[PDB]
Design a protein around this nucleic acid. Structure first.
Ligand code: MG
Ligand code: MG
Lengths: 52, 133, 51, 88, 51, 237
RNA sequence: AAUUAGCAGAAG
RNA sequence: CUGCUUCUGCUAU
RNA sequence: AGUAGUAACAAGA
């Protein structure tokens, strides 16, 4: 049994993987729902951090 | 009243194997699902703006007319009456560690009932049902 | 800085909508050491979702 | 009496919050009159794609009409009510 | 919502979430946005301190 | 069709009909015949309650047009159709609870204070009797009926209330709209079954599509290619 | 065998 | 200038 | 000075 933890979870995941996950999960829904579910990882791949 | 008219037994010291199960926390009389119970409460307290007559109006018009009789000339804020009615009607089921007594008369005193290494016998008050027996 | 540090081997470009310096680590090269890596392969993700 | 309320009077230092109090008070006044007209607004979320002034106007018009025919409202009070609602 | 009403995006009065998100992505293709901002008056007052 | 609607009816009736269509999650410019049907239905329901008032005793008198409003307080009827679903349900439940009677399971189109009955108005296009006896199977006994048609027929319940001058005005308006629908060759536009199965419309704009095209992984050009790659290939092994 | 929000605490 | 989610608890300000 | 701790308070968000 491995008691584990992942380093840099928010710093190494990618919204371009989440876009592909919502494209492969919603592989039978109508086209409007696939556009709706693909908008959010698109906005998360163009995020601009404000520096406090 | 269910605790004042209740006798206690004896505490035993030994292992207790608790199983986590979804139990009802508090005893009721008419356990209704919360959307049906909300429609019933709207038909009791706010009958003008109540909406579409559903099937819940039909199988509970006795309770509706009786509670509208008993709450006729009262001056309490109606949202307090809505939440006392939903405390009277709506169930509340949670995942608790139970061991040997899962009825809502025994879950309301579960902290004093048993522990991981002791068990207190309890004989609650009020009345019970033949299905549990 | 630490987010762009684990992704700087991917395709860096400039967005023509805003003007920002976008960085694309996905489908990039494989890691070479035990450093944190953001280059997630797409075919492995789609095969894991196939399983 | 031990269910008292402690108003957290959020007032910043050297910040005269006149107008940001007045706009919040205007929203609160509109919602208080709407809850006066419709009593179940705090128990069930009111649905409807129309204006709040139209909903309140129809509810008060029907309320005056039912209060008139059941004797609870005099004819002069009913005339005052409909003469007010015609100017809204 | 009160700022989208100025830019002729009235899709929040349709009740649902889907016309509001349609209004969101129809705001990104606007040439100029108009909204309600908050500014202030920095009034000077006499006091008794270091400054 | 639509210019006939805008140039023959009035503004408030058209707006109430448009809102009534939008309440059922539909559009006007997919079914204009439904817009015409709802406009004529609401025009008839307002024609029944045109100038009928009650006096201080509670008896129905018909006043004269172009008079002072202050001697005419209580209208004889309540027009329930033409208001939104929450307003119409509030009106019907208020009138049902106030007069001590049962609230019907459906939204009636009128209320008669003098008879204290919920009235349902239908404007059919053929035999009014079959429309009547199909209405009488879903409603049955809770509502009075007023069925009219374009061929000068009328089917009413066991209690008849409208006089023959008002019924003549109703049937005359129906025949006038019949003549002006067949004159401009719009009746075949009305009759034809324009079935259309519809769903949610979510169209992406111009900038969000560009933001989606630059947000695809390496080895891809735009989003249609990435979507087809995900939907089509087999990534096993 | 089955059964509408606001705030706080913990975890991630 | 005190984010998101889950669970539990209290209340209906 | 000091509390503290990767940056602030030690009066004017
Ligand atoms: Mg761990
Ligand atoms: Mg109707």
């Amino acid at each position: 049994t491995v008691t584990g933890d992942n380093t840099k979870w928010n710093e190494c995941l990618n919204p371009r993987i989440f876009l592909a996950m919502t494209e492969r999960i919603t592989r039978d829904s109508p086209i409007w729902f696939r556009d709706f579910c693909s908008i959010a990882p698109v906005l998360f791949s163009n995020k601009i951090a404000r520096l406090g | 009243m269910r605790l004042d008219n209740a006798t206690w037994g004896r505490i035993t010291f030994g292992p207790v194997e608790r199983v986590r199960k979804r139990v009802l926390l508090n005893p009721l009389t008419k356990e209704m699902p919360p959307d049906e119970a909300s429609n019933v409460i709207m038909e009791i307290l706010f009958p003008k703006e109540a909406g579409i007559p559903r099937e819940s109006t039909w199988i509970h018009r006795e309770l509706i007319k009786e509670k509208r009789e008993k709450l006729k000339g009262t001056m309490i804020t109606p949202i307090v009456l809505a939440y006392m009615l939903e405390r009277e009607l709506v169930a509340r089921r949670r995942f608790l560690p139970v061991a040997g007594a899962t009825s809502a008369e025994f879950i309301e005193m579960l902290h004093c009932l048993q522990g991981e290494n002791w068990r207190q016998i309890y004989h609650p008050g009020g009345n019970k049902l033949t299905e549990s027996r | 800085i630490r987010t762009h540090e684990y992704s700087n081997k991917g395709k860096q470009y400039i967005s023509d909508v805003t003007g920002c310096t976008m960085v694309d680590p996905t489908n990039g090269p494989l890691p070479e050491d035990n450093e944190p890596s953001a280059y997630a392969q797409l075919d492995c993700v789609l095969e894991a979702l196939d399983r | 009496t031990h269910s008292w309320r402690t108003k957290r009077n959020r007032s910043i230092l050297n910040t005269d919050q006149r107008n940001m109090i007045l706009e919040e008070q205007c929203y609160a006044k509109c919602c208080n009159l709407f809850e006066a007209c419709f009593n179940s607004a705090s128990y069930r979320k009111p649905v409807g794609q129309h204006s709040m002034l139209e909903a309140m106007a129809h509810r008060l018009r029907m309320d005056a009409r039912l209060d008139y025919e059941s004797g609870r409202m005099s004819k002069d009070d009913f005339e005052k009510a409909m003469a007010h609602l015609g100017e809204i | 919502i009160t700022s989208f009403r100025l830019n002729d995006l009235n899709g929040a009065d349709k009740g649902g979430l889907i016309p509001f998100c349609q209004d969101i992505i129809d705001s990104l293709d606007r040439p100029e946005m108009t909204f309600f901002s908050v500014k202030n008056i920095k009034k000077k007052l006499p006091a008794k301190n270091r400054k | 069709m639509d210019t006939f609607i805008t140039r023959n009816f009035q503004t408030t009736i058209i707006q109430k009909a448009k809102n009534t269509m939008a309440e059922f999650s539909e559009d006007p410019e997919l079914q204009p015949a439904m817009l015409f049907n709802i406009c004529v239905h609401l025009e008839v329901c307002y024609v029944i309650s045109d100038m009928n008032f009650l006096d201080e005793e509670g008896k129905a008198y018909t006043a004269l047009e172009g008079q002072g409003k202050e001697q005419n307080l209580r209208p004889q009827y309540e027009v329930i159709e033409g208001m939104p679903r929450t307003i119409a349900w509030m009106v019907q439940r208020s009138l049902a609870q106030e007069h001590g009677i049962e609230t019907p399971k459906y939204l009636a189109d009128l209320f008669d204070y003098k008879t204290k009955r919920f009235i349902e108005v239908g404007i059919t296009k053929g035999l009014a009797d079959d429309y009547f006896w199909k209405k009488k199977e879903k409603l049955g006994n809770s509502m009075e009926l007023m069925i009219f048609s374009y061929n000068q027929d009328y089917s009413l319940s066991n209690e008849s209330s409208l006089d023959e001058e008002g019924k003549g005005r109703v049937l005359s308006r129906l025949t006038e709209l019949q003549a002006e629908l067949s004159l401009k060759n719009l009746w075949q536009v009305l009759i034809g079954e324009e079935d259309v199965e519809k769903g949610i419309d979510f169209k992406l704009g111009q900038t969000i599509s560009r933001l989606r095209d630059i947000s695809v992984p390496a080895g891809f050009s735009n989003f249609e290619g990435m979507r087809s790659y995900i939907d089509n290939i087999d990534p096993k092994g």
